[PDB]
Amino acid sequence: KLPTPAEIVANLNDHVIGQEQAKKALAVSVYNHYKRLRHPKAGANVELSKSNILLIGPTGSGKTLLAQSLARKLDVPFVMADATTLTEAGYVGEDVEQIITKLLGKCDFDVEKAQRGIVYIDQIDKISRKTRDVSGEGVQQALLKLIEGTVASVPPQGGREFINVDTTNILFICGGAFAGLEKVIRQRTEKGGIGFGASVHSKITKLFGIVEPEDLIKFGLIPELIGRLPVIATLEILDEDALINILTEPKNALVKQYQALFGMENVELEFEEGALRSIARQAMERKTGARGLRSIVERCLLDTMYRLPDLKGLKKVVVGKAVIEEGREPELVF
Amino acid sequence: KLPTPAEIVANLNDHVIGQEQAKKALAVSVYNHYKRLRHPNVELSKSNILLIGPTGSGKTLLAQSLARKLDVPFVMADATTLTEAGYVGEDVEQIITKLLGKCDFDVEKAQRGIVYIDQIDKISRKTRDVSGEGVQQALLKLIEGTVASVPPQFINVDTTNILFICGGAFAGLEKVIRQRTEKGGIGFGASVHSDITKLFGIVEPEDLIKFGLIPELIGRLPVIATLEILDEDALINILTEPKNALVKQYQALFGMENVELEFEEGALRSIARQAMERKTGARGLRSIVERCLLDTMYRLPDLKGLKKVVVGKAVIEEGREPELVF
Ligand SMILES: Nc1ncnc2c1ncn2[C@@H]1O[C@H](COP(=O)(O)OP(=O)(O)OP(=O)(O)O)[C@@H](O)[C@H]1O
Ligand SMILES: Nc1ncnc2c1ncn2[C@@H]1O[C@H](COP(=O)(O)OP(=O)(O)OP(=O)(O)O)[C@@H](O)[C@H]1O
Ligand SMILES: [Mg+2]
Ligand SMILES: [Mg+2]
């Protein structure tokens, strides 16, 4: 049978912390994706179209991790695409049908399976409008007919007879960090006016949560592509508390990754709660999202990691709060 | 015998709401197409069709719906994949290869087919414009009769009798038309004065030339049919009347469970209004319904005993839960 959307989110929960709405949007679409694919395809039965998703969120919020985490249990062909390598048909670069070639390769060129797969297109915000915009609007236009059902003509599994792939039922998840999108939403929601007769109006998570096509059009996406991404799911910006859970709760938590490296030696690595909050706070100030957690941990551990493989008798190393706030050595337990 | 244009529209009516002028233009052209193919005497030339309309107006659906009852080979081409003959990309003769493939490479049948070229507006003029004007130029001798040479199942295909339906959302065209018909000048003696349906309905070759199509291609598309921007009422029928209406699609998805989905009349009108504000045409209807039903669809497979879901007007305007009836 099919897993319920709650089971999909439960699996996503082992990897992504926060973004409850983005996890919900992905889980429901994938569940509906499954249902559509087992729906009768002939007779008096209504034809079912698909709802594609656009993921809008800040750097290091978990967009790509959601897609990668989702992929672990999809049971349909899944591919990670990259919009920065796409160009118009007549130019250097990859054409939009290259995506289908990659999805098709993932299932050993079994087309019937490729047509049931799910495509994640990363960096969708990088092909916005803001001559011939070969790598920008030209790609958005080329994708219009790939996202909506067409028949892609892609090379065979050998060297360059081409394969006809019906993309009608391929689910597309697009996303990116629309960095300039908050200013547009603020301009629309806080217009106001200047001068007497006119009235003057009051002045990331909140703004993205209210995004509308008008903003994406002014940002630089074309209306024809926006309407083909009917579901807009947003990711918030991680705060100090979310960044603490990301250090220890996930299946591949940052702390767990270092404990494993120290575990290839015979030394146990422990962080104090004061350190975890200090790390999360410092990382938050770097404005790189969760990624900033790695810089802090690499920083505080650099000198103990240098010595560790040469030290003999060490059993446990403790990273206290002081080791994050001040240039202190971690306590070494022999 | 042949279906009358009224029968062609009657079949289009089960898929496309409104757009009466576009349906009339297609029905008459297809009927004339059938008549040409039966005429052995004056030599007859074909009238090709250009479909101009906004996003979500139903152009491609008309072509898809039309294709269900054509009795001749039919394909949809994609102008965004076409390039000049000497460059990477698909040469315009691939259109014939696809039309020819649909009939298992029976050339006599392929030569009698109908081709819809989507995204025709994407090969406008605005060096060597390999993916733009170069394609328009390449198509001139494909749309007007030539002898194509295409790979085996080379095969010679006479395109004289192939009907071409081209279309696209000439997004910048409404600005061009306003510049022509609304002078918008400054001064005491100036005519000064600041609606997609009204504008497109008066489109002239002059506007398409200024937009970016070449006069040689415009003259080969003698029939310009225009689609209206969907209004509030059209967008309500699009939710429930078509064979593949949006609401019916969700009722079917809910029907993959044992739960019945019901919309109130007030909800349908509210959805249509919100869809218009998104400026995506009918496609905006899907965004609104997805928004309103996201939480219900998430929980519905886990809920036990649920038998009916009611989406009222208050569930479109306010962030409320659809009434769950157990
Ligand atoms: N919500 C989250 N929960 C758990 N880990 C997260 C979260 N957000 C980011 N991370 C961590 O950040 C790292 C990279 O995240 P990710 O690849 O999702 O960023 P991204 O979406 O690619 O950002 P960008 O859009 O700038 O490319 C991973 O190690 C991941 O564990
Ligand atoms: N007049 C209409 N009647 C019924 N459904 C419509 C109508 N117009 C649009 N739609 C709906 O809009 C969705 C997409 O329609 P369609 O593919 O015709 O748009 P489009 O022609 O691709 O727009 P564009 O050419 O700008 O991409 C479908 O769900 C279709 O049912
Ligand atoms: Mg990424
Ligand atoms: Mg279309």
XYZ file of C-alpha atoms and ligand atoms in Angstrom:
724
model
C 0.000 0.000 0.000
C 0.965 3.663 0.096
C 2.479 5.494 3.066
C 0.353 8.303 4.395
C 1.659 11.888 4.212
C 2.271 11.606 7.952
C 4.661 8.699 7.365
C 6.546 10.705 4.741
C 6.943 13.589 7.180
C 7.930 11.181 9.954
C 10.783 10.026 7.723
C 11.650 13.622 6.829
C 11.717 14.407 10.562
C 14.848 12.285 10.994
C 16.737 14.701 8.731
C 15.073 18.144 8.698
C 14.253 20.205 11.801
C 11.618 22.880 11.425
C 10.023 23.730 8.093
C 6.897 21.858 9.156
C 4.894 23.365 6.293
C 7.492 22.563 3.635
C 7.618 18.964 4.866
C 3.819 18.835 4.774
C 3.629 20.262 1.253
C 6.168 17.753 -0.056
C 4.555 14.816 1.743
C 1.074 15.586 0.426
C 2.240 16.132 -3.151
C 4.229 12.889 -3.163
C 1.262 11.054 -1.658
C -1.008 12.502 -4.345
C 1.696 11.654 -6.880
C 1.470 8.001 -5.849
C -2.331 8.073 -5.918
C -2.403 9.637 -9.382
C -0.116 6.892 -10.688
C -2.416 4.073 -9.510
C -5.533 5.859 -10.785
C -7.386 4.180 -13.679
C -6.280 5.734 -16.968
C -9.221 4.879 -19.243
C -13.000 4.856 -19.442
C -15.321 7.373 -17.791
C -12.557 8.174 -15.304
C -11.477 11.796 -15.007
C -7.984 12.572 -16.227
C -5.748 13.709 -13.378
C -3.165 16.438 -13.776
C -0.343 17.143 -11.329
C 0.517 19.859 -8.818
C 4.165 20.929 -8.907
C 5.950 22.527 -5.953
C 8.167 25.590 -5.679
C 10.364 25.703 -2.560
C 11.243 29.242 -1.465
C 13.680 29.623 1.389
C 16.876 31.193 2.690
C 20.404 29.834 2.490
C 20.915 26.809 4.712
C 17.228 26.340 5.546
C 17.033 22.732 4.324
C 15.483 22.904 0.834
C 17.951 20.502 -0.758
C 18.085 18.316 2.348
C 14.306 17.908 2.152
C 14.618 16.751 -1.454
C 17.507 14.420 -0.609
C 15.800 13.148 2.542
C 12.537 12.639 0.669
C 14.382 10.631 -1.988
C 15.495 7.960 0.486
C 12.037 6.298 0.493
C 10.351 7.443 -2.733
C 10.140 4.067 -4.576
C 9.991 5.982 -7.885
C 12.900 7.241 -9.996
C 14.237 10.474 -8.533
C 16.847 12.882 -9.881
C 18.555 16.030 -8.600
C 18.658 18.543 -11.458
C 20.544 21.843 -11.601
C 19.143 24.889 -13.400
C 22.495 26.715 -13.547
C 23.673 24.399 -16.349
C 20.602 24.912 -18.560
C 20.594 27.116 -21.655
C 18.442 27.641 -24.727
C 18.289 24.964 -27.409
C 20.688 26.653 -29.829
C 23.453 27.444 -27.345
C 26.306 25.943 -25.402
C 25.094 24.258 -22.232
C 22.554 21.596 -21.397
C 19.069 21.606 -22.863
C 16.040 21.108 -20.644
C 15.585 17.563 -21.964
C 18.911 16.733 -20.304
C 16.906 16.492 -17.077
C 14.815 13.670 -18.522
C 17.987 11.938 -19.697
C 19.268 11.975 -16.110
C 15.956 10.798 -14.635
C 15.809 8.104 -17.307
C 19.342 6.921 -16.559
C 18.438 6.464 -12.887
C 16.010 3.676 -13.890
C 18.315 2.021 -16.451
C 16.355 3.647 -19.297
C 13.099 1.902 -18.398
C 10.898 4.662 -19.798
C 7.688 3.527 -18.113
C 9.423 4.044 -14.767
C 11.040 7.342 -15.780
C 7.603 8.727 -16.670
C 6.506 8.031 -13.073
C 9.495 9.696 -11.415
C 10.065 12.881 -9.450
C 12.449 15.669 -10.470
C 14.012 18.198 -8.120
C 15.355 21.257 -9.948
C 17.833 23.129 -7.789
C 18.814 26.755 -8.368
C 15.505 27.670 -10.025
C 15.959 31.237 -8.761
C 19.131 31.542 -10.862
C 17.269 31.579 -14.202
C 15.144 34.639 -13.400
C 14.929 37.638 -15.719
C 16.506 39.962 -13.155
C 18.570 40.814 -26.101
C 18.442 37.009 -25.845
C 18.513 35.869 -22.203
C 20.075 32.537 -23.119
C 20.648 31.233 -19.580
C 17.810 33.123 -17.888
C 14.311 33.691 -19.229
C 15.183 31.472 -22.187
C 15.451 28.543 -19.783
C 12.203 29.394 -17.998
C 10.512 29.364 -21.395
C 12.161 26.087 -22.401
C 11.001 24.483 -19.141
C 7.354 25.471 -19.649
C 6.742 22.531 -21.976
C 8.901 20.109 -19.987
C 7.027 20.689 -16.733
C 3.668 20.528 -18.477
C 3.160 17.276 -20.327
C 5.230 16.939 -23.494
C 7.132 14.161 -25.230
C 10.846 14.617 -24.630
C 13.200 13.204 -27.261
C 16.352 12.064 -25.486
C 19.409 10.071 -26.582
C 19.444 6.282 -26.139
C 21.391 4.434 -23.453
C 24.299 4.008 -25.887
C 26.169 6.593 -27.893
C 24.092 9.555 -29.137
C 17.217 6.195 -32.370
C 16.027 8.581 -29.669
C 13.686 7.739 -26.796
C 10.254 9.374 -26.507
C 9.398 10.189 -22.877
C 5.954 11.482 -21.883
C 6.546 13.945 -19.035
C 2.844 14.418 -18.242
C 3.061 12.483 -14.962
C 6.567 13.484 -13.851
C 6.359 15.542 -10.668
C 8.589 18.613 -10.560
C 9.874 20.183 -7.358
C 11.702 23.442 -8.022
C 13.365 25.660 -5.473
C 15.969 28.238 -4.660
C 16.892 31.163 -2.454
C 15.025 34.114 -3.964
C 17.385 36.453 -2.158
C 15.850 39.683 -3.452
C 12.276 38.538 -2.836
C 11.735 40.073 0.643
C 12.185 43.635 -0.640
C 9.509 43.078 -3.292
C 7.018 41.740 -0.743
C 7.729 44.716 1.520
C 7.224 47.127 -1.385
C 3.843 45.538 -2.141
C 2.654 45.218 1.471
C 4.029 48.587 2.681
C 3.409 50.851 -0.312
C 1.965 53.885 1.411
C 2.334 57.318 -0.119
C 4.046 60.662 0.342
C 2.419 64.014 0.892
C -0.556 65.327 2.816
C -3.701 63.984 1.167
C -2.141 60.546 0.779
C -1.942 58.163 3.727
C 1.305 56.576 4.826
C 1.538 52.897 5.729
C 3.172 51.136 8.663
C 6.582 49.543 8.152
C 12.363 36.800 6.192
C 10.031 34.175 7.623
C 6.986 36.447 7.675
C 7.607 37.888 4.212
C 8.185 34.579 2.427
C 5.092 33.177 4.147
C 2.962 35.740 2.273
C 4.597 35.452 -1.164
C 2.280 35.790 -4.158
C 2.786 35.450 -7.929
C 2.915 39.247 -8.175
C 6.168 39.125 -6.200
C 7.664 36.296 -8.240
C 6.795 38.158 -11.445
C 8.455 41.342 -10.204
C 11.334 39.235 -8.882
C 11.967 37.785 -12.333
C 9.955 34.619 -12.988
C 7.591 34.587 -15.958
C 3.830 34.180 -15.313
C 3.740 31.134 -17.596
C 6.185 29.300 -15.325
C 4.639 30.487 -12.057
C 1.244 29.081 -13.027
C 2.866 25.694 -13.677
C 4.179 25.633 -10.087
C 0.766 25.852 -8.404
C 2.011 24.961 -4.909
C 4.386 27.438 -3.282
C 5.877 26.054 -0.082
C 8.135 28.230 2.040
C 10.935 27.512 4.477
C 11.567 29.823 7.407
C 14.994 31.069 8.474
C 16.529 28.982 11.239
C 16.733 30.702 14.617
C 19.012 30.116 17.598
C 16.898 27.286 19.018
C 16.489 25.446 15.712
C 20.265 25.578 15.255
C 20.810 23.790 18.571
C 18.584 20.868 17.642
C 20.421 20.648 14.306
C 23.638 19.945 16.227
C 22.398 16.797 18.009
C 18.905 15.649 16.942
C 19.201 14.688 13.235
C 20.194 11.211 12.101
C 23.316 12.811 10.603
C 23.627 15.581 13.182
C 26.773 17.686 13.008
C 27.992 16.565 16.437
C 27.411 12.913 15.553
C 29.618 13.292 12.478
C 32.550 14.476 14.599
C 31.951 11.888 17.303
C 32.390 9.320 14.531
C 35.738 10.804 13.468
C 36.944 10.840 17.067
C 35.506 7.316 17.238
C 37.962 6.151 14.575
C 40.384 6.887 17.383
C 39.535 5.736 20.918
C 38.384 9.150 22.163
C 34.825 10.115 23.077
C 33.791 13.647 22.085
C 31.283 15.482 24.283
C 29.809 18.975 24.001
C 28.338 20.874 26.930
C 24.889 22.400 26.547
C 26.474 25.822 26.976
C 28.681 25.085 23.980
C 25.774 23.913 21.828
C 23.909 27.175 22.399
C 27.092 29.221 21.974
C 27.771 27.412 18.692
C 24.216 27.919 17.451
C 24.355 31.603 18.377
C 27.693 32.236 16.658
C 26.565 30.292 13.590
C 23.320 32.271 13.421
C 25.320 35.513 13.212
C 27.216 34.221 10.150
C 24.065 34.410 7.979
C 24.876 31.150 6.169
C 22.092 29.140 7.802
C 22.765 25.764 9.376
C 26.015 25.564 7.398
C 27.540 28.086 9.800
C 27.479 25.394 12.481
C 30.263 23.524 10.687
C 32.612 26.518 10.647
C 32.277 26.959 14.405
C 32.819 23.287 15.212
C 35.786 22.995 12.839
C 37.206 26.153 14.419
C 36.956 25.089 18.059
C 38.232 21.553 17.350
C 41.132 22.410 15.023
C 43.979 22.116 17.524
C 42.631 19.085 19.390
C 42.077 17.340 16.051
C 45.686 18.153 15.147
C 47.044 16.542 18.320
C 44.474 13.737 18.693
C 46.051 11.083 16.393
C 49.435 11.526 18.103
C 48.214 11.691 21.706
C 48.331 8.426 23.640
C 46.030 7.471 26.496
C 43.333 10.065 25.800
C 39.861 8.652 26.470
C 37.493 11.631 26.357
C 37.581 15.253 25.190
C 35.022 17.763 26.463
C 34.129 20.953 24.599
C 32.798 23.320 27.243
C 31.129 26.673 26.800
C 34.450 28.460 27.296
C 35.981 26.620 24.333
C 33.452 28.273 22.004
C 33.420 31.766 23.524
C 37.151 31.954 24.310
C 40.353 30.570 22.841
C 40.494 27.752 25.382
C 41.614 24.175 25.085
C 39.010 21.431 25.512
C 39.346 19.424 28.692
C 41.337 16.253 28.041
C 40.404 13.184 30.086
C 43.093 10.496 30.253
C -19.146 12.019 -43.973
C -17.676 15.110 -42.341
C -18.691 16.690 -39.038
C -20.012 20.199 -39.366
C -18.120 23.008 -37.601
C -20.903 22.954 -35.012
C -20.040 19.350 -34.151
C -16.364 20.229 -33.758
C -17.268 23.032 -31.355
C -19.741 20.786 -29.533
C -16.839 18.445 -28.798
C -14.558 21.343 -27.853
C -17.319 22.526 -25.499
C -16.804 19.510 -23.230
C -13.265 20.700 -22.461
C -13.083 24.491 -22.912
C -15.316 27.066 -21.196
C -15.991 30.201 -23.170
C -13.547 31.311 -25.859
C -16.335 31.073 -28.426
C -14.387 32.904 -31.135
C -11.355 30.632 -30.836
C -13.561 27.538 -31.008
C -15.394 28.880 -34.062
C -12.143 29.690 -35.862
C -10.672 26.243 -35.205
C -13.872 24.406 -36.127
C -14.231 26.198 -39.459
C -10.568 25.740 -40.372
C -10.645 22.022 -39.566
C -13.875 21.624 -41.527
C -12.284 23.414 -44.485
C -9.221 21.215 -44.015
C -11.369 18.107 -44.396
C -13.045 19.606 -47.463
C -9.711 20.407 -49.122
C -8.512 16.835 -48.628
C -11.609 15.505 -50.427
C -11.401 17.902 -53.393
C -9.513 16.420 -56.387
C -10.661 22.216 -60.797
C -9.242 25.176 -58.894
C -6.221 24.398 -56.744
C -6.949 25.221 -53.108
C -4.491 26.687 -50.630
C -4.783 26.285 -46.878
C -5.506 28.909 -44.227
C -3.250 28.534 -41.191
C -4.316 29.689 -37.731
C -2.558 31.756 -35.081
C -3.931 31.527 -31.532
C -3.246 34.637 -29.443
C -4.220 34.589 -25.799
C -3.107 35.101 -22.213
C -1.703 32.530 -19.816
C -4.314 30.021 -18.714
C -6.785 31.049 -21.422
C -7.141 27.535 -22.866
C -5.190 27.661 -26.148
C -3.317 24.386 -25.759
C -6.362 22.691 -24.239
C -8.306 23.612 -27.377
C -5.564 21.949 -29.414
C -5.512 18.906 -27.115
C -9.307 18.723 -27.144
C -9.452 19.233 -30.902
C -6.950 16.402 -31.377
C -9.390 13.870 -29.901
C -11.647 13.990 -32.989
C -9.488 14.921 -35.996
C -9.334 11.629 -37.989
C -5.960 12.803 -39.366
C -2.442 12.614 -37.921
C -1.935 15.329 -35.323
C 1.096 16.423 -33.311
C 2.124 19.220 -30.993
C 5.434 20.896 -31.754
C 7.474 22.980 -29.324
C 9.065 26.084 -30.819
C 11.421 26.445 -27.837
C 13.380 23.362 -28.966
C 13.802 24.553 -32.565
C 16.954 26.154 -33.949
C 18.424 26.969 -37.338
C 19.419 24.051 -39.546
C 23.157 24.484 -38.996
C 23.133 24.633 -35.186
C 22.511 22.363 -32.232
C 18.858 21.769 -31.421
C 15.950 20.413 -33.416
C 15.649 21.424 -37.047
C 12.169 22.475 -38.135
C 11.864 19.264 -40.168
C 11.521 17.379 -36.865
C 7.918 18.592 -36.852
C 7.308 16.442 -39.923
C 9.204 13.502 -38.430
C 6.850 13.573 -35.437
C 3.716 14.007 -37.559
C 4.994 11.191 -39.758
C 5.706 8.981 -36.747
C 2.122 9.314 -35.502
C 0.929 7.474 -38.628
C 3.693 4.834 -38.547
C 5.497 6.707 -41.340
C 2.600 6.462 -43.790
C 3.536 9.537 -45.817
C 0.215 9.879 -47.630
C -1.432 10.139 -44.213
C 1.241 12.455 -42.792
C 0.735 14.914 -45.660
C -2.932 15.249 -44.631
C -2.294 15.937 -40.947
C -2.612 18.937 -38.657
C 0.277 20.421 -36.673
C -0.022 22.569 -33.569
C 3.111 24.600 -32.815
C 3.144 25.721 -29.203
C 5.285 28.602 -27.961
C 5.269 30.379 -31.337
C 5.690 33.666 -29.453
C 9.026 32.440 -28.064
C 10.884 32.705 -31.390
C 10.312 36.442 -31.820
C 13.087 38.827 -32.857
C 13.544 40.504 -29.461
C 23.940 38.958 -34.766
C 22.572 35.578 -35.879
C 19.333 34.876 -33.989
C 19.799 31.111 -34.023
C 16.917 30.246 -31.677
C 14.652 33.170 -32.580
C 14.105 34.783 -35.965
C 16.234 32.043 -37.505
C 13.473 29.599 -36.593
C 10.712 31.831 -37.949
C 12.665 31.990 -41.200
C 13.175 28.222 -41.237
C 9.433 27.691 -40.721
C 8.433 29.881 -43.678
C 9.007 27.082 -46.188
C 7.578 24.467 -43.822
C 4.266 26.235 -43.249
C 4.009 27.124 -46.914
C 4.229 23.989 -48.997
C 7.658 22.433 -49.475
C 9.026 18.902 -49.761
C 10.535 17.865 -46.450
C 13.336 15.298 -46.323
C 13.238 13.329 -43.080
C 14.970 10.197 -41.751
C 13.670 6.634 -42.233
C 11.165 4.895 -39.972
C 15.284 9.936 -46.573
C 11.506 10.225 -46.846
C 10.043 13.008 -49.003
C 6.966 14.661 -47.470
C 4.918 17.320 -49.276
C 3.735 19.798 -46.629
C 1.423 21.666 -49.027
C -1.688 20.162 -47.416
C -0.554 20.135 -43.772
C -2.516 22.597 -41.651
C -0.504 24.562 -39.096
C -2.033 25.930 -35.905
C 0.402 28.204 -34.102
C -0.128 29.959 -30.816
C 1.345 31.527 -27.743
C 0.952 34.216 -25.123
C 2.329 37.330 -26.803
C 2.850 38.787 -23.351
C 4.275 42.087 -24.572
C 1.651 42.406 -27.292
C -0.916 44.166 -25.105
C 1.615 46.958 -24.572
C 2.235 47.206 -28.319
C -1.485 47.439 -29.069
C -2.056 50.157 -26.470
C 0.774 52.194 -27.988
C -0.989 52.017 -31.357
C -4.568 52.748 -30.265
C -4.032 54.907 -27.137
C -1.831 57.798 -28.243
C -1.149 58.773 -24.630
C 0.438 62.104 -25.515
C 1.313 65.144 -23.409
C 0.100 68.643 -24.179
C -2.984 70.815 -24.488
C -3.981 69.309 -27.827
C -2.851 65.802 -26.904
C -5.176 62.822 -26.864
C -4.382 61.540 -23.368
C -5.998 58.530 -21.694
C -4.589 55.632 -19.660
C -7.940 45.055 -20.691
C -6.350 42.087 -22.438
C -9.586 40.889 -24.034
C -10.364 44.244 -25.645
C -6.781 44.718 -26.833
C -6.158 41.271 -28.305
C -9.523 41.384 -30.080
C -8.192 44.279 -32.191
C -4.697 42.915 -32.883
C -3.292 43.750 -36.314
C -0.226 42.480 -38.201
C 1.286 45.872 -37.384
C 1.312 44.880 -33.707
C 2.743 41.422 -34.350
C 5.496 42.965 -36.481
C 6.343 45.448 -33.735
C 6.080 42.609 -31.217
C 8.709 40.606 -33.081
C 7.213 38.265 -35.684
C 8.467 38.609 -39.247
C 5.914 39.784 -41.860
C 6.570 36.647 -43.915
C 5.375 34.430 -41.066
C 2.392 36.634 -40.226
C 1.195 36.470 -43.829
C 1.321 32.667 -43.643
C -1.010 32.664 -40.610
C -3.977 34.401 -42.265
C -6.471 33.453 -39.541
C -5.739 35.162 -36.233
C -8.049 33.835 -33.544
C -7.916 35.467 -30.134
C -8.791 34.145 -26.704
C -10.370 36.230 -23.970
C -8.791 36.682 -20.576
C -10.937 34.524 -18.333
C -13.323 36.562 -16.207
C -14.801 35.736 -12.814
C -17.737 33.743 -14.184
C -15.726 31.704 -16.691
C -13.405 30.675 -13.853
C -16.333 29.290 -11.856
C -17.540 27.029 -14.655
C -13.945 25.859 -15.156
C -14.090 24.453 -11.621
C -17.078 22.148 -12.209
C -18.388 21.984 -15.798
C -15.555 20.570 -17.976
C -15.084 16.827 -18.347
C -11.736 17.169 -16.541
C -12.871 20.011 -14.288
C -10.557 20.887 -11.418
C -13.012 19.910 -8.680
C -13.687 16.567 -10.360
C -9.958 15.822 -10.285
C -9.843 16.339 -6.516
C -13.046 14.397 -5.938
C -11.351 11.545 -7.787
C -8.230 11.827 -5.614
C -10.395 11.823 -2.493
C -12.234 8.915 -4.130
C -9.010 6.909 -4.039
C -9.934 6.994 -0.359
C -13.523 6.522 0.849
C -14.177 10.234 1.474
C -16.481 12.472 -0.573
C -15.386 16.060 -1.281
C -17.984 18.837 -1.573
C -17.648 22.532 -2.431
C -20.205 25.206 -1.609
C -21.278 27.646 -4.307
C -19.853 30.478 -2.219
C -16.508 28.686 -2.114
C -16.416 28.293 -5.894
C -16.952 32.008 -6.489
C -14.393 32.913 -3.823
C -11.849 30.598 -5.461
C -12.458 32.166 -8.866
C -11.876 35.652 -7.452
C -8.650 34.670 -5.703
C -7.476 32.922 -8.873
C -7.874 36.117 -10.908
C -5.590 37.975 -8.497
C -2.767 35.515 -9.270
C -2.704 36.499 -12.977
C -2.229 32.914 -14.190
C -5.657 32.415 -15.750
C -7.354 29.112 -15.015
C -4.129 27.731 -13.529
C -4.678 29.999 -10.528
C -7.670 27.838 -9.631
C -5.337 24.951 -8.812
C -3.154 27.053 -6.512
C -6.147 28.142 -4.437
C -7.661 24.673 -4.108
C -4.273 23.185 -3.201
C -3.823 25.891 -0.566
C -7.227 25.302 1.015
C -7.021 21.485 0.984
C -3.388 20.989 2.049
C -4.109 20.218 5.704
C -7.166 18.087 4.961
C -5.240 15.980 2.456
C -2.390 15.579 4.947
C -4.655 14.257 7.708
C -7.363 12.543 5.655
C -5.422 9.267 5.053
C -4.807 8.973 8.815
C -8.292 9.946 9.995
C -10.636 7.040 10.701
C -14.373 7.173 10.087
C -14.260 10.280 7.895
C -16.921 10.103 5.194
C -17.411 13.634 3.837
C -15.463 16.900 3.563
C -17.218 20.236 3.013
C -15.253 23.245 1.771
C -17.390 26.279 2.544
C -16.942 29.898 1.579
C -15.299 30.617 4.936
C -12.608 28.023 4.145
C -11.447 29.968 1.080
C -11.494 33.448 2.627
C -10.258 32.397 6.090
C -7.716 29.850 7.273
C -10.373 27.442 8.524
C -10.566 23.682 8.415
C -13.069 22.191 5.947
C -15.962 20.719 7.885
C -15.093 17.079 8.540
C -18.157 14.838 8.710
C -17.626 11.477 10.397
N 16.144 22.444 8.756
C 17.285 21.732 8.844
N 17.386 20.623 9.607
C 18.533 19.920 9.686
N 19.650 20.267 9.014
C 19.681 21.363 8.213
C 18.466 22.170 8.083
N 18.744 23.181 7.246
C 20.034 23.043 6.859
N 20.590 21.957 7.432
C 21.989 21.504 7.246
O 22.695 22.364 6.346
C 23.533 21.600 5.469
C 23.206 21.967 4.022
O 21.801 22.185 3.884
P 21.084 22.297 2.444
O 21.905 21.531 1.434
O 19.632 21.930 2.623
O 21.176 23.863 2.075
P 20.589 24.381 0.665
O 19.089 24.216 0.694
O 21.377 23.721 -0.440
O 20.939 25.955 0.666
P 21.049 26.785 -0.714
O 19.620 26.993 -1.155
O 21.767 28.054 -0.323
O 21.848 25.891 -1.631
C 23.289 20.130 5.787
O 24.380 19.589 6.541
C 22.028 20.120 6.624
O 22.045 19.103 7.631
N -11.380 28.040 -21.217
C -11.038 27.012 -20.418
N -11.887 26.002 -20.120
C -11.520 24.983 -19.318
N -10.296 24.898 -18.761
C -9.352 25.850 -18.979
C -9.687 26.983 -19.844
N -8.609 27.776 -19.909
C -7.645 27.206 -19.150
N -8.086 26.053 -18.607
C -7.310 25.181 -17.693
O -5.975 25.669 -17.527
C -5.069 24.572 -17.369
C -3.969 24.712 -18.415
O -4.578 25.105 -19.643
P -3.742 25.338 -20.999
O -2.658 24.292 -21.091
O -4.733 25.451 -22.133
O -3.026 26.768 -20.794
P -1.884 27.180 -21.852
O -2.537 27.349 -23.202
O -0.746 26.201 -21.701
O -1.338 28.620 -21.383
P 0.056 29.115 -22.023
O -0.157 28.944 -23.508
O 0.215 30.550 -21.585
O 1.076 28.171 -21.434
C -5.892 23.300 -17.523
O -6.177 22.740 -16.236
C -7.175 23.752 -18.186
O -8.306 22.966 -17.798
Mg 20.906 23.258 -2.579
Mg 0.417 26.372 -23.495
